[PDB]
Short mmCIF file of C-alpha atoms and ligand atoms in Angstrom, two decimals:
data_model
loop_
_atom_site.label_atom_id
_atom_site.label_comp_id
_atom_site.label_asym_id
_atom_site.label_seq_id
_atom_site.Cartn_x
_atom_site.Cartn_y
_atom_site.Cartn_z
CA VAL A 529 9.00 -11.03 13.43
CA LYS A 530 5.31 -10.73 12.39
CA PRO A 531 4.58 -10.72 8.63
CA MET A 532 3.69 -7.28 7.22
CA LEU A 533 0.75 -7.12 4.71
CA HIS A 534 0.74 -4.24 2.13
CA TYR A 535 -2.71 -3.61 0.52
CA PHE A 536 -5.73 -1.28 0.30
CA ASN A 537 -7.74 -1.19 3.59
CA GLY A 538 -10.32 -3.71 2.11
CA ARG A 539 -10.72 -7.34 1.14
CA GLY A 540 -9.59 -7.54 -2.60
CA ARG A 541 -6.74 -10.09 -3.21
CA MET A 542 -5.27 -9.80 0.36
CA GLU A 543 -8.37 -11.13 2.22
CA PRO A 544 -7.46 -14.91 1.65
CA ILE A 545 -3.98 -14.26 3.09
CA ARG A 546 -5.52 -12.60 6.15
CA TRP A 547 -7.84 -15.65 6.59
CA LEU A 548 -4.99 -18.14 6.17
CA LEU A 549 -2.49 -16.40 8.42
CA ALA A 550 -5.35 -15.88 11.04
CA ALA A 551 -6.37 -19.58 10.74
CA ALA A 552 -2.68 -20.57 11.30
CA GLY A 553 -2.75 -18.44 14.49
CA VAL A 554 -0.07 -16.02 13.04
CA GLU A 555 -0.17 -12.42 14.34
CA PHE A 556 0.49 -10.04 11.37
CA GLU A 557 0.57 -6.27 10.81
CA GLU A 558 -0.91 -4.22 7.87
CA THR A 559 0.35 -1.09 6.12
CA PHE A 560 -2.67 0.30 4.30
CA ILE A 561 -2.36 1.97 0.86
CA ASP A 562 -4.72 4.94 1.45
CA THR A 563 -3.32 7.27 -1.37
CA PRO A 564 -1.77 7.02 -4.91
CA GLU A 565 1.49 8.17 -3.24
CA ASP A 566 1.39 5.22 -0.70
CA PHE A 567 1.43 2.88 -3.77
CA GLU A 568 4.09 4.95 -5.69
CA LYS A 569 6.34 4.63 -2.62
CA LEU A 570 6.35 0.75 -2.72
CA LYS A 571 7.05 0.72 -6.45
CA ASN A 572 9.94 3.32 -6.11
CA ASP A 573 11.32 1.19 -3.16
CA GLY A 574 11.75 -1.71 -5.62
CA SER A 575 9.60 -3.82 -3.16
CA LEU A 576 7.05 -5.09 -5.84
CA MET A 577 8.62 -7.51 -8.41
CA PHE A 578 5.69 -6.78 -10.88
CA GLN A 579 4.84 -3.19 -9.67
CA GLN A 580 1.67 -4.76 -7.96
CA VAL A 581 0.31 -5.75 -4.47
CA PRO A 582 -0.55 -7.87 -2.62
CA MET A 583 2.94 -7.88 -1.07
CA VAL A 584 3.84 -9.62 2.17
CA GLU A 585 7.13 -9.22 4.01
CA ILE A 586 7.86 -12.59 5.69
CA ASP A 587 11.02 -14.46 6.70
CA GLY A 588 13.27 -11.93 4.91
CA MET A 589 11.31 -11.97 1.59
CA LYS A 590 9.10 -9.33 -0.11
CA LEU A 591 6.73 -11.89 -1.59
CA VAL A 592 4.27 -10.65 -4.33
CA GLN A 593 1.60 -12.84 -6.19
CA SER A 594 -1.25 -13.93 -3.87
CA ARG A 595 -0.79 -17.66 -4.78
CA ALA A 596 3.01 -17.61 -4.05
CA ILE A 597 2.29 -15.98 -0.61
CA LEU A 598 -0.55 -18.50 0.22
CA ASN A 599 1.47 -21.55 -0.97
CA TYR A 600 4.41 -20.43 1.31
CA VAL A 601 2.16 -19.64 4.36
CA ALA A 602 0.21 -22.92 3.95
CA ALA A 603 3.42 -25.04 3.59
CA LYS A 604 5.20 -23.33 6.55
CA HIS A 605 2.17 -23.87 8.92
CA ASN A 606 1.31 -27.48 7.90
CA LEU A 607 -1.98 -26.50 6.08
CA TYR A 608 -0.97 -27.88 2.68
CA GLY A 609 -1.58 -31.64 3.35
CA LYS A 610 0.94 -34.40 4.40
CA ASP A 611 2.02 -35.53 0.89
CA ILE A 612 1.94 -34.46 -2.86
CA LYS A 613 -1.25 -36.58 -3.38
CA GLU A 614 -3.08 -34.54 -0.61
CA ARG A 615 -1.65 -31.26 -2.13
CA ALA A 616 -3.07 -32.37 -5.56
CA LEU A 617 -6.57 -32.66 -4.02
CA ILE A 618 -6.13 -29.39 -1.98
CA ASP A 619 -4.84 -27.57 -5.13
CA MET A 620 -7.70 -28.87 -7.32
CA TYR A 621 -10.32 -27.81 -4.68
CA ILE A 622 -8.89 -24.35 -3.97
CA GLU A 623 -8.41 -23.52 -7.71
CA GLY A 624 -12.19 -24.08 -8.06
CA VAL A 625 -12.71 -21.85 -5.05
CA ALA A 626 -10.41 -19.28 -6.79
CA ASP A 627 -12.47 -19.23 -10.03
CA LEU A 628 -15.81 -18.54 -8.21
CA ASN A 629 -14.02 -16.03 -5.87
CA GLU A 630 -12.61 -14.19 -8.93
CA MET A 631 -16.19 -13.67 -10.40
CA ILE A 632 -17.47 -12.21 -7.04
CA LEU A 633 -14.20 -10.12 -6.56
CA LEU A 634 -14.77 -8.36 -9.98
CA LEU A 635 -18.67 -7.85 -9.60
CA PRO A 636 -18.20 -4.18 -8.35
CA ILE A 637 -16.24 -3.15 -11.57
CA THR A 638 -18.59 -5.06 -14.02
CA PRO A 639 -19.94 -2.81 -16.80
CA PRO A 640 -23.35 -1.67 -15.45
CA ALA A 641 -25.49 -3.15 -18.31
CA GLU A 642 -24.26 -6.73 -17.83
CA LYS A 643 -23.99 -6.68 -14.03
CA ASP A 644 -27.40 -8.45 -13.59
CA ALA A 645 -26.33 -11.17 -16.12
CA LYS A 646 -23.01 -11.54 -14.18
CA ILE A 647 -24.98 -12.01 -10.87
CA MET A 648 -27.21 -14.64 -12.57
CA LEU A 649 -24.06 -16.49 -13.91
CA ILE A 650 -22.41 -16.36 -10.43
CA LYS A 651 -25.57 -17.90 -8.82
CA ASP A 652 -25.84 -20.48 -11.62
CA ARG A 653 -22.08 -21.45 -11.14
CA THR A 654 -22.48 -21.39 -7.34
CA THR A 655 -25.56 -23.75 -7.21
CA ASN A 656 -24.88 -25.94 -10.32
CA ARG A 657 -21.03 -26.17 -10.43
CA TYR A 658 -18.96 -25.24 -7.32
CA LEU A 659 -20.99 -26.02 -4.20
CA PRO A 660 -22.29 -29.32 -5.58
CA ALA A 661 -18.69 -30.37 -6.21
CA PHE A 662 -17.54 -29.54 -2.57
CA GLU A 663 -20.80 -30.96 -1.01
CA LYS A 664 -20.00 -34.24 -2.93
CA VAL A 665 -16.40 -34.40 -1.43
CA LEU A 666 -17.81 -34.06 2.14
CA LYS A 667 -20.66 -36.58 1.29
CA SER A 668 -18.11 -39.07 -0.13
CA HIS A 669 -15.91 -39.53 3.04
CA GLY A 670 -18.27 -38.11 5.77
CA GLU A 671 -15.18 -36.54 7.54
CA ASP A 672 -15.01 -33.09 9.23
CA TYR A 673 -12.33 -31.71 6.72
CA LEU A 674 -12.15 -31.69 2.91
CA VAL A 675 -8.75 -33.54 2.73
CA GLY A 676 -6.77 -36.06 4.82
CA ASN A 677 -9.38 -35.91 7.62
CA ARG A 678 -7.28 -32.87 8.82
CA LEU A 679 -7.45 -29.07 8.73
CA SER A 680 -5.96 -27.67 5.46
CA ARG A 681 -6.06 -24.39 3.63
CA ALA A 682 -8.90 -26.00 1.47
CA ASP A 683 -11.28 -25.75 4.49
CA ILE A 684 -10.14 -22.07 5.18
CA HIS A 685 -10.46 -20.97 1.54
CA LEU A 686 -13.87 -22.71 0.94
CA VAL A 687 -15.33 -21.40 4.21
CA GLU A 688 -14.18 -17.82 3.31
CA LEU A 689 -16.04 -18.27 -0.04
CA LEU A 690 -19.21 -19.63 1.72
CA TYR A 691 -19.38 -16.33 3.71
CA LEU A 692 -19.12 -14.35 0.45
CA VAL A 693 -21.90 -16.55 -1.17
CA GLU A 694 -24.12 -15.96 1.98
CA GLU A 695 -23.42 -12.19 1.62
CA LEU A 696 -24.48 -12.32 -2.07
CA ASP A 697 -27.72 -14.32 -1.27
CA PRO A 698 -28.19 -16.59 1.79
CA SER A 699 -30.67 -18.90 -0.13
CA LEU A 700 -27.63 -20.11 -2.26
CA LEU A 701 -26.42 -22.26 0.77
CA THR A 702 -30.00 -23.72 1.42
CA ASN A 703 -29.36 -27.01 -0.52
CA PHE A 704 -25.81 -27.45 0.90
CA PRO A 705 -26.20 -28.72 4.50
CA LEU A 706 -22.73 -30.37 4.75
CA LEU A 707 -21.10 -26.95 3.61
CA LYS A 708 -23.12 -25.05 6.16
CA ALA A 709 -21.92 -27.60 8.80
CA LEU A 710 -18.19 -27.03 7.63
CA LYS A 711 -18.73 -23.27 7.82
CA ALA A 712 -20.08 -23.64 11.43
CA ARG A 713 -17.21 -25.99 12.51
CA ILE A 714 -14.44 -23.89 10.82
CA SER A 715 -15.88 -20.58 12.20
CA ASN A 716 -15.49 -22.15 15.70
CA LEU A 717 -11.78 -23.12 15.44
CA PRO A 718 -10.13 -20.79 18.17
CA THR A 719 -7.92 -18.90 15.66
CA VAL A 720 -10.75 -18.35 13.05
CA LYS A 721 -13.13 -17.33 15.83
CA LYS A 722 -10.88 -14.46 16.96
CA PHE A 723 -10.45 -13.45 13.26
CA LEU A 724 -14.26 -13.30 12.72
CA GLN A 725 -15.17 -11.72 16.09
CA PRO A 726 -15.37 -7.91 16.70
CA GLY A 727 -11.91 -6.32 16.35
CA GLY A 728 -10.40 -9.17 14.29
CA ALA A 729 -8.41 -8.52 11.10
CA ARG A 730 -11.26 -9.61 8.77
CA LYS A 731 -12.17 -6.74 6.33
CA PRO A 732 -15.75 -5.54 5.67
CA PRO A 733 -17.40 -5.62 2.21
CA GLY A 734 -16.66 -2.58 0.03
CA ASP A 735 -19.12 0.29 -0.75
CA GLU A 736 -19.51 2.66 -3.82
CA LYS A 737 -16.93 5.03 -2.13
CA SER A 738 -14.29 2.31 -1.15
CA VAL A 739 -14.56 1.07 -4.83
CA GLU A 740 -14.01 4.70 -6.11
CA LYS A 741 -11.01 5.26 -3.74
CA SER A 742 -9.34 1.93 -4.82
CA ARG A 743 -10.02 2.71 -8.60
CA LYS A 744 -8.11 6.08 -8.42
CA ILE A 745 -5.14 4.35 -6.60
CA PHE A 746 -4.87 1.14 -8.77
CA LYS A 747 -6.58 2.32 -12.10
CA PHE A 748 -9.57 0.01 -12.75
CA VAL B 4 1.23 -45.93 -17.23
CA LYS B 5 1.72 -42.75 -19.31
CA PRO B 6 -0.37 -39.65 -18.25
CA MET B 7 -3.35 -38.91 -20.48
CA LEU B 8 -4.14 -35.30 -21.40
CA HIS B 9 -7.71 -34.31 -22.21
CA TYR B 10 -8.05 -31.03 -24.12
CA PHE B 11 -8.85 -29.44 -27.48
CA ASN B 12 -6.14 -30.20 -30.18
CA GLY B 13 -4.57 -26.75 -29.60
CA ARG B 14 -2.43 -24.81 -27.03
CA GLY B 15 -4.94 -23.08 -24.63
CA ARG B 16 -4.61 -23.95 -20.96
CA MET B 17 -3.01 -27.41 -21.60
CA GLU B 18 0.10 -26.13 -23.42
CA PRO B 19 2.10 -25.39 -20.26
CA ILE B 20 1.43 -28.99 -18.92
CA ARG B 21 2.73 -30.43 -22.31
CA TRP B 22 5.91 -28.25 -21.93
CA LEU B 23 6.49 -29.27 -18.29
CA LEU B 24 5.84 -33.06 -18.77
CA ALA B 25 7.99 -32.96 -21.98
CA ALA B 26 10.77 -31.03 -20.11
CA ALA B 27 10.72 -33.69 -17.33
CA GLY B 28 11.16 -36.33 -20.04
CA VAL B 29 7.71 -37.88 -19.34
CA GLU B 30 6.06 -39.69 -22.44
CA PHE B 31 2.27 -38.80 -22.42
CA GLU B 32 -0.81 -39.47 -24.56
CA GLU B 33 -3.60 -37.05 -25.63
CA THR B 34 -7.35 -37.61 -26.13
CA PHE B 35 -8.44 -34.56 -28.21
CA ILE B 36 -11.87 -32.94 -27.71
CA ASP B 37 -12.84 -32.56 -31.43
CA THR B 38 -16.67 -32.27 -30.93
CA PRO B 39 -19.22 -30.97 -28.30
CA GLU B 40 -20.10 -34.72 -27.76
CA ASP B 41 -16.43 -35.47 -26.87
CA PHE B 42 -16.70 -32.87 -24.03
CA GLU B 43 -20.22 -34.06 -23.02
CA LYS B 44 -18.71 -37.61 -22.63
CA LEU B 45 -16.14 -36.41 -20.02
CA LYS B 46 -18.82 -34.43 -18.00
CA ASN B 47 -21.21 -37.54 -18.11
CA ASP B 48 -18.29 -39.82 -17.11
CA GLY B 49 -18.02 -37.81 -13.78
CA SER B 50 -14.28 -37.23 -14.79
CA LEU B 51 -14.37 -33.37 -14.41
CA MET B 52 -14.77 -32.05 -10.80
CA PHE B 53 -15.90 -28.61 -12.11
CA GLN B 54 -17.29 -29.75 -15.57
CA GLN B 55 -14.02 -28.25 -17.12
CA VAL B 56 -10.73 -29.33 -18.82
CA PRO B 57 -7.73 -29.38 -18.68
CA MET B 58 -7.99 -32.83 -17.16
CA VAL B 59 -5.00 -35.17 -16.78
CA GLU B 60 -5.23 -38.82 -15.71
CA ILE B 61 -1.95 -39.40 -13.81
CA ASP B 62 -0.99 -41.91 -11.02
CA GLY B 63 -4.60 -43.07 -10.60
CA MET B 64 -6.06 -39.52 -10.37
CA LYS B 65 -8.32 -37.54 -12.73
CA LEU B 66 -6.74 -34.11 -11.94
CA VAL B 67 -8.50 -30.90 -13.11
CA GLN B 68 -7.32 -27.23 -12.60
CA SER B 69 -4.13 -26.43 -14.65
CA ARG B 70 -2.22 -25.20 -11.48
CA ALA B 71 -3.06 -28.42 -9.49
CA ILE B 72 -1.77 -30.58 -12.40
CA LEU B 73 1.42 -28.45 -12.85
CA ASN B 74 2.13 -28.33 -9.03
CA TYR B 75 1.86 -32.16 -8.92
CA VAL B 76 3.98 -32.82 -12.01
CA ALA B 77 6.65 -30.23 -10.85
CA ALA B 78 6.84 -31.72 -7.34
CA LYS B 79 6.94 -35.34 -8.66
CA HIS B 80 9.83 -34.66 -11.07
CA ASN B 81 11.92 -32.38 -8.74
CA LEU B 82 11.24 -29.16 -10.77
CA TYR B 83 9.72 -27.29 -7.82
CA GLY B 84 12.88 -26.21 -5.90
CA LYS B 85 14.71 -27.91 -2.94
CA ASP B 86 12.78 -26.07 -0.03
CA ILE B 87 9.68 -23.86 0.54
CA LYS B 88 11.89 -20.67 0.11
CA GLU B 89 12.89 -21.75 -3.43
CA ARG B 90 9.15 -22.67 -4.15
CA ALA B 91 8.17 -19.14 -3.01
CA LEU B 92 10.60 -17.63 -5.59
CA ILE B 93 9.48 -20.23 -8.23
CA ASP B 94 5.75 -19.48 -7.41
CA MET B 95 6.28 -15.66 -7.49
CA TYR B 96 8.02 -15.83 -10.93
CA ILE B 97 5.54 -18.25 -12.60
CA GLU B 98 2.47 -16.33 -11.33
CA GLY B 99 3.88 -13.26 -13.15
CA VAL B 100 4.45 -15.48 -16.25
CA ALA B 101 0.79 -16.63 -15.80
CA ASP B 102 -0.64 -13.07 -15.79
CA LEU B 103 1.16 -12.07 -19.10
CA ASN B 104 0.23 -15.56 -20.53
CA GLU B 105 -3.50 -14.94 -19.71
CA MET B 106 -3.47 -11.64 -21.70
CA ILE B 107 -1.93 -13.45 -24.74
CA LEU B 108 -4.25 -16.52 -24.30
CA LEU B 109 -7.40 -14.32 -24.59
CA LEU B 110 -6.18 -12.08 -27.54
CA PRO B 111 -7.87 -14.33 -30.12
CA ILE B 112 -11.35 -13.77 -28.51
CA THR B 113 -10.86 -9.96 -27.91
CA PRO B 114 -13.55 -7.93 -29.77
CA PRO B 115 -11.80 -6.87 -33.00
CA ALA B 116 -12.42 -3.04 -32.30
CA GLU B 117 -10.26 -3.10 -29.05
CA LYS B 118 -7.75 -5.85 -30.17
CA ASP B 119 -5.17 -3.18 -31.23
CA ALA B 120 -5.39 -1.42 -27.83
CA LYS B 121 -5.12 -4.97 -26.16
CA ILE B 122 -1.90 -5.72 -28.23
CA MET B 123 -0.49 -2.24 -27.19
CA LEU B 124 -1.19 -3.05 -23.50
CA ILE B 125 0.44 -6.55 -23.81
CA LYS B 126 3.56 -5.05 -25.46
CA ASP B 127 3.74 -2.31 -22.77
CA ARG B 128 3.41 -5.00 -19.94
CA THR B 129 5.97 -7.24 -21.75
CA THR B 130 8.71 -4.59 -22.13
CA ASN B 131 8.04 -2.39 -19.06
CA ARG B 132 6.82 -4.95 -16.40
CA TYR B 133 7.42 -8.67 -16.93
CA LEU B 134 10.67 -9.16 -19.01
CA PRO B 135 12.57 -6.40 -17.03
CA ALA B 136 11.67 -8.28 -13.81
CA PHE B 137 12.96 -11.68 -15.13
CA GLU B 138 16.01 -10.10 -16.78
CA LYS B 139 16.85 -8.54 -13.30
CA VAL B 140 16.71 -12.03 -11.67
CA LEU B 141 19.23 -13.47 -14.12
CA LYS B 142 21.38 -10.25 -13.91
CA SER B 143 21.35 -10.43 -10.05
CA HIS B 144 23.02 -13.95 -9.69
CA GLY B 145 24.41 -14.40 -13.28
CA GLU B 146 23.47 -18.19 -13.06
CA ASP B 147 22.11 -20.43 -15.92
CA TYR B 148 18.65 -20.97 -14.16
CA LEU B 149 16.19 -18.54 -12.44
CA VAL B 150 16.21 -20.35 -9.01
CA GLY B 151 18.64 -22.54 -6.99
CA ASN B 152 21.21 -22.59 -9.82
CA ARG B 153 19.17 -25.62 -11.05
CA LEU B 154 16.49 -26.43 -13.68
CA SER B 155 13.01 -25.67 -12.30
CA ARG B 156 9.50 -25.22 -13.74
CA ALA B 157 10.20 -21.38 -13.63
CA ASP B 158 12.78 -21.78 -16.51
CA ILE B 159 10.32 -23.98 -18.54
CA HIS B 160 7.28 -21.66 -18.05
CA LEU B 161 9.21 -18.46 -18.76
CA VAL B 162 10.89 -19.94 -21.94
CA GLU B 163 7.39 -21.05 -23.18
CA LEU B 164 6.24 -17.41 -22.62
CA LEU B 165 9.38 -16.03 -24.45
CA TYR B 166 8.43 -18.10 -27.54
CA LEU B 167 4.83 -16.61 -27.41
CA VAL B 168 6.28 -13.04 -27.05
CA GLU B 169 8.62 -13.76 -30.08
CA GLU B 170 5.48 -14.96 -32.03
CA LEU B 171 3.63 -11.71 -31.12
CA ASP B 172 6.65 -9.51 -32.17
CA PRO B 173 10.34 -10.62 -32.12
CA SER B 174 11.61 -7.03 -31.41
CA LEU B 175 10.08 -7.39 -27.89
CA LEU B 176 13.04 -9.57 -26.84
CA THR B 177 15.67 -7.11 -28.37
CA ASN B 178 16.55 -5.44 -25.00
CA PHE B 179 16.64 -8.76 -22.99
CA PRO B 180 19.84 -10.59 -23.87
CA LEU B 181 19.95 -12.77 -20.69
CA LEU B 182 16.39 -13.98 -21.53
CA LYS B 183 17.34 -14.77 -25.12
CA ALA B 184 20.29 -16.73 -23.67
CA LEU B 185 17.99 -18.70 -21.30
CA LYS B 186 15.63 -19.46 -24.23
CA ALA B 187 18.60 -20.75 -26.29
CA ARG B 188 19.96 -22.91 -23.37
CA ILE B 189 16.56 -24.30 -22.29
CA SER B 190 15.47 -25.01 -25.99
CA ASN B 191 18.69 -27.23 -26.20
CA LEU B 192 17.99 -29.46 -23.14
CA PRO B 193 17.51 -32.93 -24.75
CA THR B 194 13.84 -33.34 -23.64
CA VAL B 195 12.81 -29.76 -24.59
CA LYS B 196 14.58 -30.11 -27.96
CA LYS B 197 12.58 -33.20 -28.95
CA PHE B 198 9.37 -31.45 -27.75
CA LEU B 199 10.17 -28.40 -30.03
CA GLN B 200 11.47 -30.44 -33.05
CA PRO B 201 9.18 -31.72 -35.83
CA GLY B 202 6.81 -34.44 -34.51
CA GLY B 203 7.07 -33.26 -30.84
CA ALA B 204 3.88 -32.73 -28.83
CA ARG B 205 4.16 -28.89 -28.95
CA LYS B 206 0.91 -27.39 -30.47
CA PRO B 207 0.84 -24.72 -33.12
CA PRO B 208 -0.69 -21.22 -32.71
CA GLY B 209 -4.48 -21.20 -33.37
CA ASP B 210 -6.12 -19.65 -36.50
CA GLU B 211 -9.60 -18.01 -37.02
CA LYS B 212 -11.09 -21.49 -37.61
CA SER B 213 -9.38 -23.29 -34.60
CA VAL B 214 -10.75 -20.41 -32.39
CA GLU B 215 -14.26 -20.81 -33.94
CA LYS B 216 -14.20 -24.61 -33.39
CA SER B 217 -13.08 -24.20 -29.64
CA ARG B 218 -15.71 -21.43 -29.06
CA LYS B 219 -18.66 -23.64 -30.15
CA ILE B 220 -17.32 -26.58 -27.97
CA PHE B 221 -16.46 -24.55 -24.78
CA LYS B 222 -18.82 -21.53 -25.21
CA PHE B 223 -16.33 -18.55 -24.85
N1 GSH C 1117 -1.80 -12.09 -10.08
C1 GSH C 1117 -1.62 -10.97 -9.00
C2 GSH C 1117 -2.58 -9.90 -9.32
C3 GSH C 1117 -2.18 -8.64 -8.54
C4 GSH C 1117 -2.88 -7.43 -8.98
O1 GSH C 1117 -3.66 -7.39 -9.92
N2 GSH C 1117 -2.63 -6.32 -8.21
C5 GSH C 1117 -3.36 -5.07 -8.27
C6 GSH C 1117 -4.04 -4.85 -6.92
S1 GSH C 1117 -5.19 -6.25 -6.43
C7 GSH C 1117 -2.43 -3.92 -8.59
O2 GSH C 1117 -1.38 -3.83 -7.96
N3 GSH C 1117 -2.85 -3.18 -9.62
C8 GSH C 1117 -1.98 -2.17 -10.20
C9 GSH C 1117 -1.26 -2.56 -11.48
O3 GSH C 1117 -1.56 -3.68 -12.05
O4 GSH C 1117 -0.45 -1.69 -11.92
C10 GSH C 1117 -1.88 -11.62 -7.61
O5 GSH C 1117 -2.71 -12.46 -7.50
O6 GSH C 1117 -1.08 -11.27 -6.72
N1 GSH C 1118 -9.16 -22.44 -13.68
C1 GSH C 1118 -9.28 -23.53 -14.67
C2 GSH C 1118 -9.89 -23.03 -15.96
C3 GSH C 1118 -10.58 -24.09 -16.72
C4 GSH C 1118 -11.40 -23.62 -17.87
O1 GSH C 1118 -11.66 -22.48 -18.10
N2 GSH C 1118 -11.80 -24.57 -18.70
C5 GSH C 1118 -12.43 -24.39 -19.95
C6 GSH C 1118 -11.44 -24.82 -21.05
S1 GSH C 1118 -9.80 -24.10 -20.97
C7 GSH C 1118 -13.76 -25.17 -20.01
O2 GSH C 1118 -13.78 -26.39 -19.76
N3 GSH C 1118 -14.81 -24.43 -20.38
C8 GSH C 1118 -16.15 -24.95 -20.41
C9 GSH C 1118 -17.04 -24.45 -19.15
O3 GSH C 1118 -16.49 -23.67 -18.33
O4 GSH C 1118 -18.19 -24.89 -19.11
C10 GSH C 1118 -7.85 -23.99 -15.05
O5 GSH C 1118 -6.92 -23.25 -14.90
O6 GSH C 1118 -7.77 -25.24 -15.40
#
């Protein structure tokens, strides 16, 4: 049976699960939360351990917590390294990805006065902290993948973040040629290609009106 | 060689690593960051992949990212379940612990005007979302541990959080007898007992002046 993904019809916290399942070549289905009552239904079903989504029905579980879902998917589909040493590298890399992702994820709901400052900070962190660190990993071993010379969730999560960075400002990737190269190679894996092409499961960026709709469903 | 823990002499993001290593019966050492120049030294050493701590030297790695360090320690010392299904439950539980932890962790640096509202929200989440959810897990199987009828990092991380809740307001545990019972059993494991007794590695709560010291070292 295909996993079932419960979320708003948008990127938010479910987008990295879509990318990772897609990258693993796993067909999945989505039940969109379009109304407050769609959300209320999942809570009243007892489906949500913490009264929150993402939730993914997979292998007889109703998994909540984005990290728990990703860890399970990655381990099941051999995208979490070969040994605990490789996992330690993967985990360290993707937790960095997670921190920069979280800043970008919450930009839309930043108090309007400090939004410019927040964009400056994200660009500063992007160019001076995160991308330098990942560029140095690729520089150090000259291999096609971040870890174990093999495709892992680290490649998928980083490449998903490079697309977001490019959407924020394409000049931010200018000084990171090895990361641009990763992005091009990962984008051309058969499974990721289908995911990114027209009609794939990838979600578009939100607008003023998708933000307003999500805010009256989730309260933020 | 004993692991080496690099952090401020305080709880912050390193406290759950201290608990987990202690619970696994692993002797460790700590190099405290007492001054801006202590921090600057780690950055200039190239020790910090993202220019941040926690950092833990263990088994020839300089691991940063609290989750990467915990995932490694838990897997090494057989505290991460027997299979990926048990890890999915463990992960789902501890990610909920992590969300309530994060609210408590940032209380000290909440603007003093909205601190009361923040404490109200934390108590609401504690009594109406998190503790109910963990109480239901123990109720459902009536076993001594949250997962696999066996000690896991889920027990250690939850019992750490129950101590923090008790520090915030002891009446918050009143309606959660099975969680009080877990806290009492876990607190009496030989390794955790030493960790909690006088002269153990457990750190005290911060004060106005430990918060001020950490703020001018880490800029937060
Ligand atoms: N730590 C959780 C965060 C989940 C979360 O914040 N969920 C939101 C939607 S993205 C929600 O359900 N909000 C409603 C609420 O907290 O009541 C995860 O990563 O899964
Ligand atoms: N996601 C990281 C957070 C690390 C973090 O925020 N580190 C702080 C100290 S707890 C720091 O080094 N701050 C200085 C800075 O970011 O420049 C983790 O969980 O380890």
